[PDB]
Symmetry: C3
Amino acid sequence: MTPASYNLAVRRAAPAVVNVYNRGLNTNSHNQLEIRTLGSGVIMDQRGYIITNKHVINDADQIIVALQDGRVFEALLVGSDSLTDLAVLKINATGGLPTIPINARRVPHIGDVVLAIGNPYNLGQTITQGIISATGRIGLNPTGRQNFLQTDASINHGNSGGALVNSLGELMGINTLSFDKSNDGETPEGIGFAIPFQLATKIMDKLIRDGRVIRGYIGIGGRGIVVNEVSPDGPAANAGIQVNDLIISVDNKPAISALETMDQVAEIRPGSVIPVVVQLTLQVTIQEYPA
Amino acid sequence: MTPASYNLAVRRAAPAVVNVYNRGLNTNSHNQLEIRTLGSGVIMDQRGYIITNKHVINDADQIIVALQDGRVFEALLVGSDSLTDLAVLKINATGGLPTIPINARRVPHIGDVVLAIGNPYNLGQTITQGIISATGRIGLNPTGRQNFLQTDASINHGNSGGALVNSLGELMGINTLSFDKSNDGETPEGIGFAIPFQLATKIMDKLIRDGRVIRGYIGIGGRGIVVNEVSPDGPAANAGIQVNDLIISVDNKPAISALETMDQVAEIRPGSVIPVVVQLTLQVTIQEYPA
Amino acid sequence: MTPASYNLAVRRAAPAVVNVYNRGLNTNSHNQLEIRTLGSGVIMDQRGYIITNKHVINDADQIIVALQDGRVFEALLVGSDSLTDLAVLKINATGGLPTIPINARRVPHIGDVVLAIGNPYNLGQTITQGIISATGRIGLNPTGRQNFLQTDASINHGNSGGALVNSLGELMGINTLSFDKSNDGETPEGIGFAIPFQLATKIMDKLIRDGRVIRGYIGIGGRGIVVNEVSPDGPAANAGIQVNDLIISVDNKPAISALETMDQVAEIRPGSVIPVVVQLTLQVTIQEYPA
């Protein structure tokens, strides 16, 4: 017979994950480019756009990307975002580049076998398999390290930026980090997180068209949609809205949930204005999220 | 094609695992119900019975159970058992309850893919896959943390009480991982334990019919069946039997092994009496296991 | 339906993995055979040869081997090798022995599902599944703990010597197991190593025909094939070759790579002589690797 195996996935996607190297100049007294850090990255399209974790390329005087085919490139940082730890690099490749399979039509499911491609502890490219333990949201609104994708695939230090792909090689997400906890008593085995591919995608496109992800701020909270503690003063305060009420429509559509609502405000460019219901339609001008 | 995936099992059994919260009153000075601990639990039948680990609900002034569908319930402790760390709660659900798939006809096998549904570190429901690395016994006699079910599936803190199900959603066991994990000089990966479903079944039923699991005590040891150290002074001493001999028939059937023998004595209600053989048939009255 | 399962593989290969016990006499003051250590081992053929990790049987006054069928044997150490941590024992079994499936025709692939059979923490035989994350070389030349086989299958202490088999039971490698940490901060999760079956084979045969693995030493380094730091003063000095040049043909064949070249010199018995090329063909006598 044939042994059970996920090599097909490896063949189809592995060639697209890269080693990202963060090189600083002031790392030594002789001020030469030294490898301050390193992680992994996923070549997104043939134009040369590579996704990766921000915490990898932060304060990097240089960024080198290297392919499994041996080609080495200097990368231009086109933008990052703290609220997701995603960063978008760009190599200028002539000759063709391998690209991570993407299937925008595929919906990830709790339980789907998934492999994590990356370069942890800088041992070279390694693959590890697990399943999707929790899916998380593809919204643009930051919530925490719980609305990501969760996997029991082994995510070590060096998998950051790597690819989490299903058995068909399809990119399910960008590995971000492990769960190491905050303290001890023990270690959290098999609890890793990845940013959903669908979101990495949204973020990348923005990081390209703007050099930074522009989120629409409405400063309000809650649990229609409860408005519990709406004392940020930013946009809430400035133009209708109270420190305790219930909204009906974020802009001109239902305000069923709090999460699904914020996820809309953020997708609204600054300066714009929209009619906020509770039936006293009070308009408000959207600002830009805080630093 | 279609991504390899164990989602079917997740769909069939996930809805039945619950978040069990141990709330104490004297946890703070304002003596309010504070979440002293927490674990997971499996809704066993439509009557509202839920299995869980004892160590989760111990000394709980209150017990709250929450479903993935959002419904929350106050749970009535119907019993527990130290020798297995199993506890049976009971929520009073009108409207219908989701129930963990069970297939008493199914025999677990070393190597079967199995998923562990539970809520570790209180991150919300998480699934993790592994295989059965060892099966263990379904007996009622306590032996240790070796005659359980052993799985490399990721069992973290908060998986206690959760379900361990095979690819079909069939309940293979109740996650219980107990603490002997460590040596000296490095943390034990992929070695978790679960109580065979067959036994969790036996125990729950008893916890229901008696509020406590009543075990039949004999007071002997060994390796027919060797009667090594038979100096408990229990019912063994009180009625024939020596501090060094060989038994022939626990009650009126073969005494082939020591394990399979104890597992019978325990299934014999106290006060009863049975003929013990070795050919000098000496009768003995069964007592009840120690506290 | 049927539960997803790797049981077939377990049935086919588990029976061949054995518990290896290292018993020393001077472990106590009453100088009796005490279990100084322990690991696992794979019965390679019906003659009674068993492979294992050197670091298990080192300085063992005695060695006991035990089968899953219950049979116990006293083993004869036929040899070991440091550069691979492989040891070969030999039990003298009459009545027949179970043997690990081997398919020398099979080529291991990154991503192949694979199970690790072994006895970690001495809890009895345990199975764990993972995938091959990196393959490594089957050469006879020592390189490091990187040209081994790499798997995310859980390799714990007591898995050393165990077998790593694919879904068909086929022997993929002998679990070695690198001590993971070597420093702190975090712990290398899911990164285990095994010696390729293809090499364990080559090594065992040598350990048999010679009691020690005789390697052919040259004394050179580099990156044709660069000869960068050819100052070891062995046979390289003694008869042509410079401290900085480029070789053309290890013996009478291409010298394309440095790795694949050394892998040849080692397979050349001492005393022999071969023509080295670089076009000034200078012959050299092969010595024997250092202790």
